[PDB]
mmCIF file of C-alpha atoms in Angstrom:
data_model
loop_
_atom_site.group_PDB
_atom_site.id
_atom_site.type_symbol
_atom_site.label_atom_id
_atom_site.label_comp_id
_atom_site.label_asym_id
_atom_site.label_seq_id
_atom_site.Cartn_x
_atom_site.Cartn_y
_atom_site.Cartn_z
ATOM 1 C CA UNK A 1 15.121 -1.500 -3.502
ATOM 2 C CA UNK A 2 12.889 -3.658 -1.241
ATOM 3 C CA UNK A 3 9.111 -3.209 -0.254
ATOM 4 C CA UNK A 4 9.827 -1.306 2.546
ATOM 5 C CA UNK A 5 11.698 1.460 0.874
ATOM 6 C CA UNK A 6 9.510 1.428 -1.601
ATOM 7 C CA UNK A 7 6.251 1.641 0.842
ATOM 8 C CA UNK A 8 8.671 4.280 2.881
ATOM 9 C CA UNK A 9 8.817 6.538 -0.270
ATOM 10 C CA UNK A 10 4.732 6.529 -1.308
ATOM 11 C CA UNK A 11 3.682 7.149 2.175
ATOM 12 C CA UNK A 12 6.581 8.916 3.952
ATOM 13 C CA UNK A 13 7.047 9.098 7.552
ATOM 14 C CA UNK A 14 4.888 11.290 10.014
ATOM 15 C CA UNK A 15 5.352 10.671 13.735
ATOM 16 C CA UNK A 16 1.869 12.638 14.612
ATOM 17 C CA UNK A 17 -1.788 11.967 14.296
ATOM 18 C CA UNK A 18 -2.368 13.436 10.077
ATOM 19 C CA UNK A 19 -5.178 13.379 7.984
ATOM 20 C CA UNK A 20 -4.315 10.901 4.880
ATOM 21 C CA UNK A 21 -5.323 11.907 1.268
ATOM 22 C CA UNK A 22 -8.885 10.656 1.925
ATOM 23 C CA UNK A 23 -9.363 12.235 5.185
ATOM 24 C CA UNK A 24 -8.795 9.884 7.786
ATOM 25 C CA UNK A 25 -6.809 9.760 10.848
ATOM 26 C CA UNK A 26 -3.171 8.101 10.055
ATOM 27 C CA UNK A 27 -0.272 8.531 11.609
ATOM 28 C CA UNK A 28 4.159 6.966 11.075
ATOM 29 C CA UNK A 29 4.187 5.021 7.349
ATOM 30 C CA UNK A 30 0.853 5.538 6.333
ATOM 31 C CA UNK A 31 -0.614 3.195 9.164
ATOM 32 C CA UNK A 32 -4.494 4.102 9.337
ATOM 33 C CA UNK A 33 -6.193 4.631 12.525
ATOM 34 C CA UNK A 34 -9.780 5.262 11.954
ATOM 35 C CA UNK A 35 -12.200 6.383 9.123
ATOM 36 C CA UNK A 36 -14.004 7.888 12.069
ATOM 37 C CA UNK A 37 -14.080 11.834 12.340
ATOM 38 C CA UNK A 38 -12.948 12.210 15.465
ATOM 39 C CA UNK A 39 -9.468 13.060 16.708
ATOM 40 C CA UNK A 40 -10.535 11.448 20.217
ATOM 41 C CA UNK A 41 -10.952 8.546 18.566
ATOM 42 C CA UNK A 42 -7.789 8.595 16.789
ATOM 43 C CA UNK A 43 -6.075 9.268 19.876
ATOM 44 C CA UNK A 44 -7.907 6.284 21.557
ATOM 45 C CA UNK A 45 -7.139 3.566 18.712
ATOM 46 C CA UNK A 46 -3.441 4.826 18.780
ATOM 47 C CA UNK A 47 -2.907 4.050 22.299
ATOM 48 C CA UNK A 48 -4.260 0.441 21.652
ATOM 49 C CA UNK A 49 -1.870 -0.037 19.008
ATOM 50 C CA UNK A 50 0.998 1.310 20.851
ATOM 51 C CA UNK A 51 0.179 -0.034 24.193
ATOM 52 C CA UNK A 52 1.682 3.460 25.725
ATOM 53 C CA UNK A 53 -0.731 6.713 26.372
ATOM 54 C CA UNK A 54 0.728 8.661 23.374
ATOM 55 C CA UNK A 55 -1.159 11.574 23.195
ATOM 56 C CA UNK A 56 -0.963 11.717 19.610
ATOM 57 C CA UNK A 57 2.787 11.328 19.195
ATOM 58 C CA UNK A 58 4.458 8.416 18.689
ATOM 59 C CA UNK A 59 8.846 7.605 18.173
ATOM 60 C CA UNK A 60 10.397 6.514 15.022
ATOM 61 C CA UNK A 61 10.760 2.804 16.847
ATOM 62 C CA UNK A 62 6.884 2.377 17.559
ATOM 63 C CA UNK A 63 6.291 4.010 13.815
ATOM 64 C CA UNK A 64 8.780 1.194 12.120
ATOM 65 C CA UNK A 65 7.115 -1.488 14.490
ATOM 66 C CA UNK A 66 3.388 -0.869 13.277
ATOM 67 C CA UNK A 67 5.571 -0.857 9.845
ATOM 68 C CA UNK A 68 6.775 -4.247 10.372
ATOM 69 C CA UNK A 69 3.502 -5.063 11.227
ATOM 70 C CA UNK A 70 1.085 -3.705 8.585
ATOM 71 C CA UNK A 71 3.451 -5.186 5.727
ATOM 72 C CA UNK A 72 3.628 -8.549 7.061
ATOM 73 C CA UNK A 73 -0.117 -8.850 7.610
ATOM 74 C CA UNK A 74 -0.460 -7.498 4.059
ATOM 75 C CA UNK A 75 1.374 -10.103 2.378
ATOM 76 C CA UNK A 76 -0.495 -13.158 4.767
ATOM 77 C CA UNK A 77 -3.888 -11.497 3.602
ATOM 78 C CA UNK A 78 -2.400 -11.847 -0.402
ATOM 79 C CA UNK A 79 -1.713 -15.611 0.905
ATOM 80 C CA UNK A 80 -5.145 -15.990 2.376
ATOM 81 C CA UNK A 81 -6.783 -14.580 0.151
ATOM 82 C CA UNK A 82 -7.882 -16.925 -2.922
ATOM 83 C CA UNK A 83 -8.132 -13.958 -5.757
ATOM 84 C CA UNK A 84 -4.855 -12.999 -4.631
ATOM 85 C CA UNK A 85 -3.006 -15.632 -4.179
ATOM 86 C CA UNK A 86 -3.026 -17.183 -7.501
ATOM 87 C CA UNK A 87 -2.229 -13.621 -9.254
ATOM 88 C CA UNK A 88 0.817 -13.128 -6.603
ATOM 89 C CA UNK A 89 2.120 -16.588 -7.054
ATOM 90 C CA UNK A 90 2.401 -16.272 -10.619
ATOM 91 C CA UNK A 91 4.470 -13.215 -10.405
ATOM 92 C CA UNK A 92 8.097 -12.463 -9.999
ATOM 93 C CA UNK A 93 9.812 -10.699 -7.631
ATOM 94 C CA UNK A 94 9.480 -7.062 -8.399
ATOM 95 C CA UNK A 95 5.417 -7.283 -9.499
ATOM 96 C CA UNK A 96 5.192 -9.131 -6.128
ATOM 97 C CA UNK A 97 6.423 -6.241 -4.116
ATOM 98 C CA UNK A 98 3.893 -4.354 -6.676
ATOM 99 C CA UNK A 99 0.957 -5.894 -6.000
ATOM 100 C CA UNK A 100 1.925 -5.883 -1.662
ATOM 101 C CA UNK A 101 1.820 -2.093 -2.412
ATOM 102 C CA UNK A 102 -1.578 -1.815 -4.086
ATOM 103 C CA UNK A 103 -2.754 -3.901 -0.672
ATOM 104 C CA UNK A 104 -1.133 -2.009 1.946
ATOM 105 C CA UNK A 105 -2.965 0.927 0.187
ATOM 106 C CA UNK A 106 -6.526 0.139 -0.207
ATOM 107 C CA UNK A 107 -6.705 -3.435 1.330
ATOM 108 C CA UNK A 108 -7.494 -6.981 0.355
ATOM 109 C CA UNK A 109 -10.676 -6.581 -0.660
ATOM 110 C CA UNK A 110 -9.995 -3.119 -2.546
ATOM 111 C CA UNK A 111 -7.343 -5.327 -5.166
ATOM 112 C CA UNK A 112 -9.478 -7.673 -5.318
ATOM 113 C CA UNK A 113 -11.474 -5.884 -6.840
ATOM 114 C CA UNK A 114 -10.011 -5.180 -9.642
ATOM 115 C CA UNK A 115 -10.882 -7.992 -11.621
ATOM 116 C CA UNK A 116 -9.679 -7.656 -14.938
ATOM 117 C CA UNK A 117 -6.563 -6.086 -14.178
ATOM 118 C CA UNK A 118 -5.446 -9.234 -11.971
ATOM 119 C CA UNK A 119 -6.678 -11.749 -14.612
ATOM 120 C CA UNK A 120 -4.593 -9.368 -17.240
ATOM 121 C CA UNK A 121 -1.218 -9.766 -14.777
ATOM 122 C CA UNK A 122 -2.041 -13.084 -14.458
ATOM 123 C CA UNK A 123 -1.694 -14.020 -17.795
ATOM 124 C CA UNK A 124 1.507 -11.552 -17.981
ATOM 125 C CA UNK A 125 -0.004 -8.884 -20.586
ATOM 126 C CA UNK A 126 1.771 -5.895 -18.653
ATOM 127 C CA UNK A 127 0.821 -3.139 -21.195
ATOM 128 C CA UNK A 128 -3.038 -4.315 -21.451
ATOM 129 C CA UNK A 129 -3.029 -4.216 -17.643
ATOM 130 C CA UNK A 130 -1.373 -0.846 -16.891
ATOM 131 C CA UNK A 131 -4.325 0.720 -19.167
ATOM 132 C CA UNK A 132 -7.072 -1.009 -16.940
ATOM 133 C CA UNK A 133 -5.468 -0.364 -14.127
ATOM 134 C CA UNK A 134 -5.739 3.245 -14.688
ATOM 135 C CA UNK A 135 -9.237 3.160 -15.105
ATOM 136 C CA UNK A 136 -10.110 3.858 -11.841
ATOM 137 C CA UNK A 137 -11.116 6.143 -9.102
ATOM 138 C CA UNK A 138 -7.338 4.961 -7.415
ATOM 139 C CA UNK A 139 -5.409 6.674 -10.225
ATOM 140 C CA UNK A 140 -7.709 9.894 -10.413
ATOM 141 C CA UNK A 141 -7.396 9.999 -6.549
ATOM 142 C CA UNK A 142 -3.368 9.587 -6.166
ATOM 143 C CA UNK A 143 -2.212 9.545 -10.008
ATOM 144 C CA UNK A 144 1.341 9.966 -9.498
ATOM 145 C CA UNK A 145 1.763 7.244 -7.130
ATOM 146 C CA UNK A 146 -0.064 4.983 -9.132
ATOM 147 C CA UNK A 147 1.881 6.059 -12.199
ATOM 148 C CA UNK A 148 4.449 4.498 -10.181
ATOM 149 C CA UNK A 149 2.734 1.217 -9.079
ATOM 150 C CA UNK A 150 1.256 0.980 -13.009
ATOM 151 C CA UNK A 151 4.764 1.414 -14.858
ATOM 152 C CA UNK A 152 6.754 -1.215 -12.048
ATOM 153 C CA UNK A 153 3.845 -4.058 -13.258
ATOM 154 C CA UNK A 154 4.631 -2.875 -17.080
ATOM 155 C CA UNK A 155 8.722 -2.789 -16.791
ATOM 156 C CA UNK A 156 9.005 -5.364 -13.796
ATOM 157 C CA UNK A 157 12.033 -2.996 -12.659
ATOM 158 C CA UNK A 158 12.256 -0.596 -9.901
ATOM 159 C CA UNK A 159 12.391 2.316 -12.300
ATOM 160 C CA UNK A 160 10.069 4.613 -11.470
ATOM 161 C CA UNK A 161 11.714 4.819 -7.596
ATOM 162 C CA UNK A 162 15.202 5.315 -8.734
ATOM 163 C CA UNK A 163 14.469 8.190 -8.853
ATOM 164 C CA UNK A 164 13.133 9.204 -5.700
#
């Protein structure tokens, strides 16, 4: 299991312009267009991230290229970033591809947030964080993917997707 399976299975694949969990405009592997309410403006934004008039429809190429390119500038904003860094550099591989999750989901600044929980990884106390970590409007929003996210930082395996 890498990060991008395990990204492809918590936000699946759509090749039109959907509404996300929260409402907003998304469209291929969970790429966000706007917060704004309008589907013009949805259109509009996907064009400039295409680069091709798409009228709301886009191939499974140009869905897997916005892929590449939302998970790579999610790990570079981790390396930027200087609560993140220090939380993802003392992890190991599997918690790494955790924590790229968490930040492809709600951003940087969202994670970053989370103060206690990263200074609880940090320090490697798995089952203290995974209780924090659930304390939140992020696990009352989308609880069964962060069940997910929650038992990977507690087990460090790829458990909870083996079976998906």
């Amino acid at each position: 299991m890498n990060i991008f399976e395990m990204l492809r299975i918590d936000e699946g694949l759509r090749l039109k312009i959907y509404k996300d969990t929260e409402g907003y405009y998304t469209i291929g592997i969970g790429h966000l267009l706007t917060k704004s309410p309008s589907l013009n403006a949805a259109k509009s934004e996907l064009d400039k991230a295409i680069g091709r008039n798409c009228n709301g429809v886009i191939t499974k190429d140009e869905a897997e290229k916005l892929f590449n390119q939302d998970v790579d500038a999610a790990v570079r904003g981790i390396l930027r970033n200087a609560k993140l860094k220090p939380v993802y550099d003392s992890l190991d591989a599997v918690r790494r591809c955790v924590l790229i999750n968490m930040v492809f989901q709600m951003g940087e600044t969202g994670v970053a947030g989370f103060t206690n929980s990263l200074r609880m990884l940090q320090q490697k106390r798995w089952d203290e964080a995974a209780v924090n970590l659930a304390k939140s409007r992020w696990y009352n929003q989308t609880p069964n993917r962060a069940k997910r996210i929650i038992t990977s930082f507690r087990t460090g395996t790829w458990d909870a997707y083996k079976n998906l």
